[PDB]
Amino acid sequence: HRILIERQEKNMILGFLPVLQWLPKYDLKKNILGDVMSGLIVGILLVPQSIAYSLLAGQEPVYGLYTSFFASIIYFLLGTSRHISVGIFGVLCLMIGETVDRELQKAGYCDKSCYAIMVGSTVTFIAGVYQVAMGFFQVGFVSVYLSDALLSGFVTGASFTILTSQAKYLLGLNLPRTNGVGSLITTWIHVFRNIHKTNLCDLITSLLCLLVLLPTIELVVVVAATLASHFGKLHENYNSSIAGHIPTGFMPPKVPEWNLIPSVAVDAIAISIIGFAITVSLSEMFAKKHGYTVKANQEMYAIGFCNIIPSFFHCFTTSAALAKTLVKESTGCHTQLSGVVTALVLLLVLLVIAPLFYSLQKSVLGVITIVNLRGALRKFRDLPKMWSISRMDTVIWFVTMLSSALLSTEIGLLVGVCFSIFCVILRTQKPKSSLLGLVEESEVFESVSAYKNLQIKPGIKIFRFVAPLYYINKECFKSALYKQTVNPILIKVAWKELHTIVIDCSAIQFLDTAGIHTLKEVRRDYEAIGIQVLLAQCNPTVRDSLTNGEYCKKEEENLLFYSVYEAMAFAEVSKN
Amino acid sequence: HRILIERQEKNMILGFLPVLQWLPKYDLKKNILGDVMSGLIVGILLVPQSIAYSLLAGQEPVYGLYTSFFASIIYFLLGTSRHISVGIFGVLCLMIGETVDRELQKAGYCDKSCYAIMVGSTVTFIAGVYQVAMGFFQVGFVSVYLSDALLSGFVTGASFTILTSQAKYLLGLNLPRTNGVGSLITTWIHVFRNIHKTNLCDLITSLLCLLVLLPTIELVVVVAATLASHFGKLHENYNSSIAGHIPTGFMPPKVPEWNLIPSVAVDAIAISIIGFAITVSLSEMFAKKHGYTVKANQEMYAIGFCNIIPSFFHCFTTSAALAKTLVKESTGCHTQLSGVVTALVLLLVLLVIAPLFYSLQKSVLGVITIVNLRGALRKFRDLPKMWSISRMDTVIWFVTMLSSALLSTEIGLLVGVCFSIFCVILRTQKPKSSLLGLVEESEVFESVSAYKNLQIKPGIKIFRFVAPLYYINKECFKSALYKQTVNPILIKVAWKELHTIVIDCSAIQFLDTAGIHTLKEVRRDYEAIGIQVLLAQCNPTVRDSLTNGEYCKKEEENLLFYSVYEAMAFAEVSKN
Ligand SMILES: O=C([O-])C(=O)[O-]
Ligand SMILES: O=C([O-])C(=O)[O-]
Known part of the structure; x- marks a missing residue:
């Protein structure tokens, strides 16, 4: 009556450049609206975003514009997704600034601003070739080790580090630079220590900008703030922080210095991993939104060469936002040509009307950065819902958040990945x-x-x-x-x-x-x-x-x- | 026709000292034979083992004898297993010597020998309290993270580091001390570099000892080597390495210096973990051999206080061997009183007949250490059998071996523990x-x-x-x-x-x-x-x-x- 069962006997050019086959399929009438509106809006919007994150990364306004423009052009020539916005990412620039500050301290501070680019571009060039190599060898499975509950606690914790860092500019204080583990608490300590020396004008304008922008517009806020700062001696009479002169034109291309390769490779690992994990994702999610498919390997290549050709021209790392992919979605663009228009607008800003934002203050830039972290720092309202669905995922999210917000961003990502793997081990042991x-x-x-x-x-x-x-x-x-x-x-x-x-x-x-x-x-x-x-x-x-x-x-x-x-x-x- | 199933509605003194209840149950006639034979044999055998590992740990003969004697006495007064031999362990002394050398380099070299004990005892005292605390709080589950294929590659790789280190003494060379990652290859490089300056007498006696002991006896080999070295000027005419004077008596107890606690805690973690993982194990396996039970928490306490009370009297860490638990098994002891006899013999050696081994050379000690690593370094013949049973366990064993033999012992245990957890993760992904x-x-x-x-x-x-x-x-x-x-x-x-x-x-x-x-x-x-x-x-x-x-x-x-x-x-x- 026993069951008896017997065992069984023991097209390279076309693929590289999507626009080769995408241009003939593209129709001007089909994709006309939204492309023009996106270029001016997204472009004028990426001007403040660039000037600010450049200061977050430790550079001048010109290099942020370089990065945004070159990223848009390269992704248009190489990318496949028809809705993604490849430009400057806040978390990536935060990590870039961390490494730049570390190497600046090691060297001791060719001006100091010039040396930041050499470190900044070199980190990005290594990050790009890592993305190219992992894409070419088909070793892109490493994305599976970064969940959506670790890559959402890392971006909610690193958003506190960006808001703490910006707290200096909101309060109009010339605080010392703080780095390493525990920089957040140290910076807050300095803030409360020097709170008596805060600028009255900077506090007033930051409070007004916060009370106006948050209930609500960003472009008109920038225009109004720049106009108010102009036609006045508040840069001297009020001694308020000012963005300053933005160099015009394009500097000659400079090959990254290979002297710093071994020092910057370790950070480039994290830069490249998060850059492709947070792109191939919002490029696949948006592709599923509109009912089309995106090639993961082609995304690998596009985001890899997006950090090499720009890296030759004083640019840092570029990654999809999903914080400005929504601005361009609301616009209604249905093709990647819109980004080109954005690049054109950036070009129209890069050499022309460049000193128009000379008088723009830094407090308003900090407020703009603040009212854009809203999304990640509102992920707190979803905590009870996350707890109901899965308690262990909630614990992993909280641990990644606290580690990234209190023990540096890179250590806070490695703590997240390892804890998630151990939580799976913990699920295995003491089982049902x-x-x-x-x-x-x-x-x-x-x-x-x-x-x-x-x-x-x-x-x-x-x-x-x-x-x-x-x-x-x-x-x-x-x-x-x-x-x-x-x-x-x-x-x-x-x-x-x-x-x-x-x-x-x-x-x-x-x-x-x-x-x-x-x-x-x-x-x-x-x-x-x-x-x-x-x-x-x-x-x-x-x-x-x-x-x-x-x-x-x-x-x-x-x-x-x-x-x-x-x-x-x-x-x-x-x-x- | 659907299946319808409804869910369900939503004695402290006696325990501390086993001998309190074990002595009345003990019968002199039942446990008489083997106890006397073990004491002299195991004791005379732990004299070379002690003098050698002390040099492996960076100390003098007297402290190895201190450690062995105090460990035996303490475990007799506290231990529960009736067959285990708690004394000096080769791998533990290797790690102790690594930390001692690191702190010696940090300080720069109260004689230098005296400062080794202060570091050596302090590491052991912290290791003991870690075992006591984890036992008291019932946090001993951490043993589950060290498998028998990681704790058998760590002990096969660390056996090459002990045989390489001893290669200095076998060849009669005064090589410089090498530490850090890659010490094995560097030491071999120095060996081949200075191979021309090797002592002829040391090479001859080491070759004779290797050709005699390996085919086969250890006690008679020690006696013969000491007798041959005595009544001769080979310490001067042949310039051969000699163990030297062994201090007699007991020094006054010295409290461990609390200045070095934060530096030695990290290494004490690994010391305590391996010390209880490799004891509670061979104490449970031998208990199952003879059909009795051993309390894991009582083993925790016994091996914890075995590293505190001795630590007050210039002793380093103690752990079960299972390399000299077999010598005492072959003897036939059926109780823990035999260890007391061993301690007595050690005492009879510690103050009396101490300079009897003054003329004993170091090459013979290295050969004795060599012909005792045989067991772990023969685990290579079991590689194909391990491959047949489970390929992933074989890979984990080889990785732990190579990491411990080429990238320090502690890094080679943390690499083993993490790789095993990832191998479980790798088993989960790409599944059937x-x-x-x-x-x-x-x-x-x-x-x-x-x-x-x-x-x-x-x-x-x-x-x-x-x-x-x-x-x-x-x-x-x-x-x-x-x-x-x-x-x-x-x-x-x-x-x-x-x-x-x-x-x-x-x-x-x-x-x-x-x-x-x-x-x-x-x-x-x-x-x-x-x-x-x-x-x-x-x-x-x-x-x-x-x-x-x-x-x-x-x-x-x-x-x-x-x-x-x-x-x-x-x-x-x-x-x-
Ligand atoms: O969830 C994510 O991947 C993110 O927001 O970066
Ligand atoms: O297998 C073990 O645990 C050992 O030999 O240490």
């Missing part, structure tokens, strides 16, 4: 394990601890262990099996109803050397007392591992079964 | 997934890729995914499900036989937020084409996660089933 009962008028065996009125038979116990059996939870497996049924060691040492134990191995995913040893020891110990142990519903991998580990002899039979019902039927017959 | 077929004249569904003649029905496909569904393997789950059956995205974008898909969730252990989202997306995408997706055999945890994640509405039914047979039956009826 319970007896099973028979469902009346059926052949289904379910947990007698989760379902009621489950019929069980005296003398036979069915034990289910959900997790895989390996070195981590072998002791837990033995302890649970002994807590249920009987403890063979205790009965043997005491000697010196129950007669059959069935283990349901359906949920066991794999077996380690310790797991094979644990199963053999369990069977031998129970057989010493006079109990027979039958394994049921072992997957083919577990069956092969047991056969390789010599759990049973070839001549021996009546030991492994394909179903719990078959094992129960065999045990009842043997007792008779 | 295949279609299932129906077994004829039964109700068992098995893989159609592993079993032959499995009947399947057109229009209905049963898909099994072995691993848990979470952020790491969500993309793999979607890709596998699309490779089998049909790819809903491609059919939808093309439009712009198969009609039912059953997913067997029996092997799925848990579901992450990404897993719940992946399942919902899969169901929606297939329902768009016109395919119905039914989940079957979901464990109660997965069912609760789906209910919490709002996978199905309360009013909605015919979506989750308790068995694949029930799901198949329902699908056939619906098609009719």
